[PDB]
Design an enzyme around this catalytic site. Structure first.
Site, PDB file in Angstrom:
ATOM      1  N   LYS B 163       0.826  -1.203   0.000  1.00  0.00           N
ATOM      2  CA  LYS B 163       0.000   0.000   0.000  1.00  0.00           C
ATOM      3  C   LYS B 163       0.862   1.255   0.000  1.00  0.00           C
ATOM      4  CE  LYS B 163      -2.373  -0.929   3.719  1.00  0.00           C
ATOM      5  NZ  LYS B 163      -1.627  -2.174   4.042  1.00  0.00           N
ATOM      6  N   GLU B 189       0.928   5.664  11.491  1.00  0.00           N
ATOM      7  CA  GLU B 189       1.878   4.877  10.717  1.00  0.00           C
ATOM      8  C   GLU B 189       3.285   5.066  11.275  1.00  0.00           C
ATOM      9  OE1 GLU B 189       1.656   2.582   8.685  1.00  0.00           O
ATOM     10  OE2 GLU B 189      -0.481   2.608   8.189  1.00  0.00           O
ATOM     11  N   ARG B 190       4.243   4.396  10.642  1.00  0.00           N
ATOM     12  CA  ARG B 190       5.622   4.440  11.103  1.00  0.00           C
ATOM     13  C   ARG B 190       6.213   5.829  10.890  1.00  0.00           C
ATOM     14  NH1 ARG B 190       4.137   0.030   8.418  1.00  0.00           N
ATOM     15  NH2 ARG B 190       4.533  -2.030   9.334  1.00  0.00           N
TER      16      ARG B 190
HETATM   17  N1  ADP Z   1       6.389  -2.476  -6.164  1.00  0.00           N
HETATM   18  C1  ADP Z   1       7.019  -3.306  -5.327  1.00  0.00           C
HETATM   19  N2  ADP Z   1       8.073  -4.012  -5.793  1.00  0.00           N
HETATM   20  C2  ADP Z   1       8.704  -4.848  -4.963  1.00  0.00           C
HETATM   21  N3  ADP Z   1       8.442  -5.110  -3.680  1.00  0.00           N
HETATM   22  C3  ADP Z   1       7.399  -4.397  -3.246  1.00  0.00           C
HETATM   23  C4  ADP Z   1       6.649  -3.494  -3.981  1.00  0.00           C
HETATM   24  N4  ADP Z   1       5.643  -2.942  -3.203  1.00  0.00           N
HETATM   25  C5  ADP Z   1       5.806  -3.513  -2.035  1.00  0.00           C
HETATM   26  N5  ADP Z   1       6.846  -4.404  -1.987  1.00  0.00           N
HETATM   27  C6  ADP Z   1       7.260  -5.200  -0.836  1.00  0.00           C
HETATM   28  O1  ADP Z   1       6.584  -4.709   0.306  1.00  0.00           O
HETATM   29  C7  ADP Z   1       7.491  -3.942   1.130  1.00  0.00           C
HETATM   30  C8  ADP Z   1       6.870  -2.605   1.449  1.00  0.00           C
HETATM   31  O2  ADP Z   1       5.548  -2.807   1.990  1.00  0.00           O
HETATM   32  P1  ADP Z   1       4.479  -1.603   2.126  1.00  0.00           P
HETATM   33  O3  ADP Z   1       4.373  -0.832   0.871  1.00  0.00           O
HETATM   34  O4  ADP Z   1       4.903  -0.775   3.341  1.00  0.00           O
HETATM   35  O5  ADP Z   1       3.094  -2.294   2.495  1.00  0.00           O
HETATM   36  P2  ADP Z   1       1.962  -1.935   3.560  1.00  0.00           P
HETATM   37  O6  ADP Z   1       2.008  -0.488   3.918  1.00  0.00           O
HETATM   38  O7  ADP Z   1       0.652  -2.355   2.885  1.00  0.00           O
HETATM   39  O8  ADP Z   1       2.236  -2.868   4.744  1.00  0.00           O
HETATM   40  C9  ADP Z   1       8.806  -3.869   0.356  1.00  0.00           C
HETATM   41  O9  ADP Z   1       9.921  -3.893   1.242  1.00  0.00           O
HETATM   42  C10 ADP Z   1       8.753  -5.123  -0.516  1.00  0.00           C
HETATM   43  O10 ADP Z   1       9.168  -6.280   0.202  1.00  0.00           O
HETATM   44 MG    MG Z   2       2.342   1.160   4.965  1.00  0.00          MG
END
Ligand code: ADP
Ligand code: MG
Ligand code: ATP
Ligand code: MG
Lengths: 46, 487, 530
Positions: B163, B189-190
């Protein structure tokens, strides 16, 4: 299929019961904290 | 009892983040901000917000800071109104908190006006019909679930599905060249993610400290108490509403995460004497979210293009909080963990997404036809997967093998490397034009690329990148064959 | 503006949209479930509804408007009367609040809580209510006075079906007398103001506002206002029922009303039940839906047709509210997500859909066609269930079941004559030689064109598809009648012959890079054109 259906029925019944018990426990906790204050009424007039 | 500015009260109860205040002259109106004037040896000021009236004199409030070192009978003074947040172009490039105080250590901010964070949502007569496609540069979003300018977008997904990365990509693609202003609201969030976003925006010149910035940051994070996480969104939305109305500009509003607002309300609900609802959310889950959502809209004065990230606890899309947000959006992007585990990014499940402008009247006929064909083919492939698992690919008919091959190429062709996930992927991202996506998918559907290797469609951009990757694959395969030939 | 009688108490506590009062000196009483006005200012009032009458004298109130202006210690006045909203022919074409106030867009009074007609005041459901969709009108008949549930998942077409049903009546009300005209009432509960505006524009585009009224209780409104929307809607619809007229009430949707009622009950400290809902949720929905009836000829013969909508999560029909609504309505129209994404639109799942009224809510011609269509579709489904992983056998039942499934695809409601004629043509085997891909184009040519006239071969004297007034002749005289059967068969035979000779022949000879795309675009356009 029969085994999974039995598990599904059992799990849904348990989930409904657990959710209802949780809600009622929260309600009972809220009710218990409530304290009945002093009654401001004409006690002698009786 | 009209002007309650300066009215004195005393703290009567302190249980967690909820505090009760007693006023001899009458409790001020609900949503009023109170300041704890008593000197309690605290390192930070304490401010309370009235949420309920227990009687004509007592009022239950929620604190915005930690209630540590708070004694009973502590003097409290009303502020004469709701929580106010600075507004105007002087807030561009700055970082604020729930209370509207700059936290970037960059000097005082020159504020000419302040507005309360609680406002009435626009009425029916204040609704504007804006049906215009928003090009995000992402093949899946542009094709299956195109976004509309001035509309509401939702990125539903679990934990770690991507996300935040999608939000960063949308920023990089839409905000750098945006004509108007932007407002990013970090809710529960973080904090490190906020720092990364701030650094990226400064590097991308969206926040030009020496020049002119075009975005505002309002952060209430996990470390903050539930009181601040339930009002940071209101503060950011108030800034966006001012930019929409007074400035008459087209503003972008990024919210991450909107679920934390509901979570904070649920956390505080228990101490407010409210019986929990199903799952365990507050009974006012629907109305509390609806009031905030109705304020995030485009009116006849200006337009707000809102992108909201929705968290689905434990991937349970049927959870009341995620389920209540679907009806408040114009375009829903549902992410799936299964897709992510297969190496497909963004992990979008096209069979669960939906868009309001997915109509021939709004978008071109070719776009609508291609999107519908892609969806139908994906559904047919999902149906055929069960038969393949039971029988096997060899047992399928030739009419079905072609569908299987095309569907696999479509599934791999939906993946795209983002310019913000270069560290995660190790490859440069792509920005695919809307027309290029439509043409590429239309060609793929009718079999113009049946002879192209399947892996040539994996993590690429338009059709040209597919051909280049196919050529590279052929060259390396020829090199391997030559190496084998010499042996 | 509600007229007040006397003060009853003062505002004591405020919990969001729920407030409690305390007795005034002398402990004056207030009638239960009546309207009260809170003097939020010297010249303004905030509406409220009595919900609880505690022993000590406190009163539980549900705030309906101007909640931001309500404060503890204010003065409360009582009206002593139930909620009455304006109703009559002067409300059609307007957006109205559940309290009766008109909502700006960019005759008599009626109680919101009234008892439903008794047993002796009802009559069997015989008059049909055409939704305009071939699938629903054939497999799930709806009759005036019936309560049909539109149950489905998010983004499956629940609102579209109801809106099309409302719009489908515009072309009928204009022709027949106003006595038999259907007056629609669309109730939006907990929706967005944008959606209400879009629906208003859509209704106005087809001229449906003249016969329709919208009652909107959108999000950001108090839960109490959303809790009364269906009752006010039926009250508006019950005005026409008690005057020998027919009304159609749509609730979009009862899922949110249940949540609002649960919020109101929980905030007022009432015993929660399954899924935290109170013990009165089933009673609430039952007394809402039971008010939709079909009055007997001795009471004017009016009716109210209910089309409640319900949203299921992950196709879970085991939810508390979904089960309650299903157990009350007379059948259901289940919408399947897989069918919607697969192309079938409306995505009516005929397997899980049911109409307890049955053929009694069908016209003579429609009943005759459906009697055989249902059997053909059942046989086609049975045959398909045994050929998932094998080459199918092209028998007559399947050759016609495929066309029937292809004909059910449509975007806009279909005029009765067009739909019945197309179904009859497919039923008698006139589409056996037509490929499944060209069925929509064949139907479009049959409806909006006339091959016989184009080639100077038509011999029929009166039976032409451009004579839109044959619809009522077909309704009075079934298609299987000597008056119309001969010319109907002649026209169908001639149209099929000309189509196969001219159009499908050229279609099968398409070999190019642009002609193929043109044919595909034409087929897609015809798919959503009829
Ligand atoms: N476009 C992408 N390409 C590769 N890995 C991705 C991508 N989007 C997310 N990830 C994976 O997810 C991680 C980041 O998660 P994040 O975007 O913070 O999700 P959320 O906020 O939904 O928990 C990255 O470190 C990788 O492991
Ligand atoms: Mg997130
Ligand atoms: N018969 C149909 N043919 C083609 N498209 C349709 C049809 N019915 C609905 N749609 C389209 O499908 C989408 C969803 O329709 P709709 O708004 O009726 O869904 P819904 O059941 O009301 O879902 P929601 O929970 O969003 O209200 C819209 O884009 C609509 O135009
Ligand atoms: Mg809907």
């Amino acid at each position: 299929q029969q085994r999974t259906s039995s598990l599904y029925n059992k799990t849904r019944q348990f989930g409904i019961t657990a959710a209802l018990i949780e809600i009622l426990s929260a309600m009972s906790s809220l009710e218990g904290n409530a304290m009945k204050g002093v009654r401001r009424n004409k006690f002698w007039e009786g | 009892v009209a002007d309650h500015k300066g009215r004195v009260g005393h703290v009567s109860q302190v249980i967690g983040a909820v505090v009760d205040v007693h006023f001899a002259d009458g409790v001020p109106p609900v949503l009023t901000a109170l300041d704890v004037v008593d000197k309690l040896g605290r390192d930070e000021p304490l401010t309370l917000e009235i949420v309920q009236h227990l009687d004509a004199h007592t009022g239950r409030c929620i604190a915005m800071q930690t209630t540590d070192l708070l004694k009973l009978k502590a003097k409290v003074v009303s502020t004469g109104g709701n929580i106010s947040v600075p507004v105007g172009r002087e807030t561009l490039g700055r970082i604020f908190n729930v209370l509207g105080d700059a936290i970037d250590q960059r000097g005082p901010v020159g504020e000419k006006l302040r507005m309360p964070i609680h406002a009435v949502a626009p009425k029916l007569a204040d609704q504007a019909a804006e049906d215009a496609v928003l090009t995000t540069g992402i093949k899946v979003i542009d094709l299956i679930l195109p976004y509309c300018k001035g509309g509401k977008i939702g990125l539903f997904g679990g934990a770690g599905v991507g996300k935040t990365v999608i939000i960063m990509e949308l920023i990089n693609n839409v905000a750098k060249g945006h004509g108007g202003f932007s407002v990013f609201a970090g809710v529960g969030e973080r904090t490190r993610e906020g720092t990364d976003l701030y650094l990226e925006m400064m590097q991308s010149k969206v926040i030009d400290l020496k020049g002119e910035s075009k975005c505002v940051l309002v952060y209430g994070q996990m470390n903050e108490p539930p009181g601040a996480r339930a009002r940071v969104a209101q503060s950011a939305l108030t800034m966006a509403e001012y930019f929409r109305d007074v400035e008459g500009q087209d503003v972008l509003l990024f919210i991450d995460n909107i679920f934390r607002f509901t979570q904070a309300n649920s956390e505080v609900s228990a101490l407010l004497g409210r019986i929990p609802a199903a799952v365990g959310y507050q009974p006012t889950l629907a109305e509390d979210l609806g009031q905030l959502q109705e304020r995030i809209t485009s009116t006849t004065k200006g337009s707000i293009t809102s992108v909201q990230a929705v968290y689905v606890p434990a991937d349970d899309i049927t959870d009341p909080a995620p389920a209540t947000t679907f009806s408040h959006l114009d375009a829903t992007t549902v992410l799936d963990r299964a897709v992510a585990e297969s190496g497909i990014y963004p992990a979008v499940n096209p069979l669960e997404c939906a868009s309001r402008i997915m109509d021939p009247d709004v978008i071109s006929v070719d776009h609508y036809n291609v999107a519908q064909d892609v969806v139908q083919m994906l559904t047919k492939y999902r149906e055929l997967q069960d038969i393949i698992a039971v029988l096997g690919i060899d047992e399928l008919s030739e009419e079905d093998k072609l569908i299987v091959d095309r569907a696999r190429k479509l599934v791999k062709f939906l993946s795209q490397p983002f310019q913000v996930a270069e560290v995660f992927t190790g490859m440069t991202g792509h920005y695919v034009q809307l027309d290029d996506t439509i043409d590429s998918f239309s060609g793929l559907l009718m079999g113009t690329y049946d002879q192209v290797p399947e892996m040539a469609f994996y993590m690429v951009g338009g059709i040209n990148s597919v051909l280049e990757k196919a050529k590279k694959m052929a060259e390396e395969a020829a090199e391997l064959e030559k190496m084998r030939r010499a042996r | 503006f509600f007229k007040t009688t006397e003060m009853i108490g003062y505002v004591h506590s405020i919990d969001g949209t729920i407030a409690t009062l305390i007795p005034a000196p002398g402990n004056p009483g207030v009638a239960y479930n009546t309207i009260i006005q809170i003097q939020v200012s010297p010249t303004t009032f905030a509406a409220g509804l009595v919900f609880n009458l505690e022993k000590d004298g406190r009163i539980g109130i549900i705030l309906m408007d101007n909640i931001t202006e309500v404060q503890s210690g204010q003065k409360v006045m009582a009206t002593g009367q139930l909620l009455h909203i304006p109703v009559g022919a002067g409300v059609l074409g307007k957006v109205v609040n559940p309290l009766g106030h008109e909502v700006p867009v960019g005759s008599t009074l009626g109680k919101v809580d009234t008892g439903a007609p008794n047993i002796v005041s009802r009559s069997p459901v015989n008059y049909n209510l055409l939704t305009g969709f071939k699938a629903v009108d054939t497999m799930i008949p709806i009759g005036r006075g019936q309560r049909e549930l539109i149950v489905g998942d998010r983004q499956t077409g629940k609102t579209s079906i109801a809106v099309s049903t409302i719009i489908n009546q515009v072309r009928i009300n204009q022709q027949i007398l106003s006595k038999n005209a259907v007056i629609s009432i669309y109730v939006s509960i907990g929706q967005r103001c944008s959606n209400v505006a879009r629906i208003h524009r859509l209704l106005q585009s087809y001229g449906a506002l003249r016969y329709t009224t919208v009652m909107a209780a959108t999000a950001a409104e108090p839960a109490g206002l959303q809790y009364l929307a269906p009752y006010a809607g039926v009250t508006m619809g019950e005005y026409f029922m008690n005057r020998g007229r027919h009304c159609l009430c749509v609730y979009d949707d009862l899922s949110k009303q249940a949540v609002a009622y649960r919020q109101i009950s929980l905030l007022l400290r009432r015993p929660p039940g399954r899924e935290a809902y109170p013990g009165d949720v089933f009673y609430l929905h039952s007394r809402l839906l039971e008010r939709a009836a079909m009055l007997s000829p001795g009471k004017g013969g009016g009716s109210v047709t209910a089309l409640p909508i319900v949203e299921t999560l992950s196709n879970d029909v085991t939810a508390y509210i979904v089960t309650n609504v299903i157990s009350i309505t007379d059948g259901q129209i289940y919408l399947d997500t897989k069918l919607f994404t697969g192309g079938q639109r409306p995505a009516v799942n005929i397997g899980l859909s049911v109409s307890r009224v049955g053929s009694s809510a069908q016209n003579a011609a429609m009943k005759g066609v459906a009697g055989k269509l249902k059997g053909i579709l059942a046989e086609y489904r049975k045959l398909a269930a045994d050929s998932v992983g094998g080459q199918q056998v092209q028998t007559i039942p399947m050759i016609r079941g495929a066309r029937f499934v292809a004909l059910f695809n449509q975007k806009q409601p279909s005029y009765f004559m067009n739909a019945i004629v197309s179904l009859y043509a497919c039923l008698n085997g006139y589409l056996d030689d037509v490929k499944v891909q060209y069925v929509k184009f064949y139907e479009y040519l049959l409806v909006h064109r006339d091959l016989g006239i184009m080639y100077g071969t038509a011999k029929n004297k009166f039976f032409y598809m451009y004579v839109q007034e044959l619809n009522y002749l077909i309704r009075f005289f079934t298609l299987n009648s000597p008056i119309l059967h001969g010319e109907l068969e002649e026209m169908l035979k001639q149209h099929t012959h000309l189509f196969l000779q001219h159009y499908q022949s050229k279609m099968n000879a398409i070999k190019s890079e642009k002609d193929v795309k043109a044919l595909k675009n034409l087929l897609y356009s015809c798919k959503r054109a009829v």
